[PDB]
């Protein structure tokens, strides 16, 4: 019934293309298209890991109590902004052992909703109500890179990189839940297969993107640097 | 025309959506939606283990004894408020042999409904006062992180982290028991498959946030103080 333009750029046109690609369109159906899209995006971001949904940010360690941000889903490289240094993640028992038994390497763990560090780190960041003030990040400022949970659509004008990069993915993953809402199985299976194929293509692209500029050959690393 | 909202975040809207995806509008069926949601939430939390439903609480060790909370499902890392000293679980036959044949590691067991620590550690609870004052944690404390079981809704406006994270999960798992009540097999199969896929996605997400960001080689060397 409804019309739509060639590019599905925004939520407003996606919620109409959904009803178009499925003639099952009416009052009792269009009102829940938002819920189907919500379920589809949740099913997507639950396991999708790609750059465009990443986010880098400084942390405040406070030697221990340092807390995990709300948007934490998976941690990428973690380091500082001074001469470079990469942390490695270990288990709580290793850190508890390091505490008593005893600074080039630095470890960390995940205690519930915290990030513990064996050394008494003193990373500094501006407080909450600070107005602007980039602060010219001081030293001992760790920078964390992780995968952040993207926002949920709340306005027809609201757009997202997924719409501009792969709208068919959302359209199929939401037609799945649509054909589930109504009684239909063939469409469910076909849309699920197509969405899974698109997601596989995207993750394979991400894979072929990483470490894709030259071959590798470990040069028999046996710690040439031992003197220190 | 039962109309639900887009951000499904409460118990009433979830109930209305369950009654919507099962178009039948009859008292014989609507009056049991609460029972179906109860069965679903009891099916999910019975084996779901994730951070958000965890909880931290201070124990009240008197003399190498304790009592498990009434909301205990599974225990993970335990330690003290200072220096760490993660505890490690053992069995009765060992924590009772240590006493006979026994810088100081810690061990604990489960004697039905009582944690039994060998060294006879002592713990204390923090300041209780509710006069808008901090808890003022106590010295010689022991922290425990367990997967607490959530409370039943028993109210419309009530909610939970699941309704915001994965409402489709509870929706499908309760429509499963609904389509079991009425003899509908294909629907049962579809809803169960969808719920299983959702739970698989969730547990996989909980695994890709674990100790992943590092090589698995160079096995650690936590040997001893004797080099």
């Amino acid at each position: 019934m409804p019309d739509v333009q060639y590019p599905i750029n925004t939520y407003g046109w996606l919620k109409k293309a959904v009803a178009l690609w499925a003639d099952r369109d009416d009052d009792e159906f269009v009102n829940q298209i938002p819920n189907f899209i919500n379920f589809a995006e949740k099913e997507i971001y639950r396991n999708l890991r790609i750059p465009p949904l990443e986010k880098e940010v400084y942390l405040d360690i406070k030697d221990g109590v340092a807390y995990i941000p709300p948007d934490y889903l998976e941690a990428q490289w973690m380091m500082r902004a001074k001469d470079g240094t990469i942390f490695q993640v270990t288990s709580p028992e290793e850190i508890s052992y390091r505490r008593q038994h005893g600074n080039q390497p630095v470890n960390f763990a995940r205690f519930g909703s915290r990030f513990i560090f064996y050394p008494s780190i003193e990373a500094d960041t501006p407080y909450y109500p600070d107005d602007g003030s980039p602060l010219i990040p001081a030293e001992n400022s760790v920078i964390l890179s992780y995968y952040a949970d993207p926002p949920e659509f709340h306005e027809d004008t609201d757009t997202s990189t997924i719409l501009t990069i792969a709208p068919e993915l959302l359209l199929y993953f939401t037609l799945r839940h649509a054909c589930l809402f109504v009684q239909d199985d063939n469409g469910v299976q076909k849309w699920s297969a197509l969405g899974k194929a698109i997601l596989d293509e995207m993750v394979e692209q991400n894979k072929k993107q990483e470490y894709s500029g030259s071959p590798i050959a470990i040069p028999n690393n046996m710690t040439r640097l031992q003197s220190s | 025309m039962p109309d639900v909202q887009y951000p499904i975040n409460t118990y009433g809207w979830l109930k209305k959506a369950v009654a919507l995806w099962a178009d039948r509008d009859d008292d014989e069926f609507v009056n049991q939606i609460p029972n179906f949601i109860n069965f679903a939430e009891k099916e999910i939390y019975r084996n779901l283990r994730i951070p958000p439903l965890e909880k931290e609480v201070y124990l009240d060790i008197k003399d190498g004894v304790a009592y498990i909370p009434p909301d205990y499902l599974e225990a993970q890392w335990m330690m003290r408020a200072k220096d760490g000293t993660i505890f490690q679980v053992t069995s009765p036959e060992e924590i009772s042999y240590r006493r006979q044949h026994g810088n100081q590691p810690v061990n604990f067991a489960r004697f039905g409904s009582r944690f039994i620590f060998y060294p006879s550690i002592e713990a204390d609870t923090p300041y209780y006062p509710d006069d808008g004052s901090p808890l003022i944690p106590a010295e010689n404390s022991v922290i425990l992180s367990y997967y607490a079981d959530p409370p039943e809704f028993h109210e419309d406006t009530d909610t939970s982290t699941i309704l915001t994270i994965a409402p489709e999960l509870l929706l499908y798992f309760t429509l499963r028991h609904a389509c079991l009540f009425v003899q509908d097999d294909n629907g049962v199969q579809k809803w169960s498959a969808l719920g299983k896929a959702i739970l698989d996605e969730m547990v996989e997400q909980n695994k890709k946030q674990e100790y992943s960001g590092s090589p698995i080689a160079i096995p650690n060397n936590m040997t001893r103080l004797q080099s």
């Binding site: 109590v65 | 200072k82 808008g132 004052s133």
Partner: peptide, 27 residues
């Protein structure tokens, strides 16, 4: 020197504890 993770409501109530003293010191 490490504490437990209270619920958000408890942290909120703890934050408001830092108002009455200020109100008196301003009075």
């Amino acid at each position: 020197s490490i504490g437990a993770y209270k619920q958000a409501a408890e942290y909120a109530a703890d934050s408001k504890y830092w108002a009455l003293l200020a109100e008196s010191k301003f009075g």
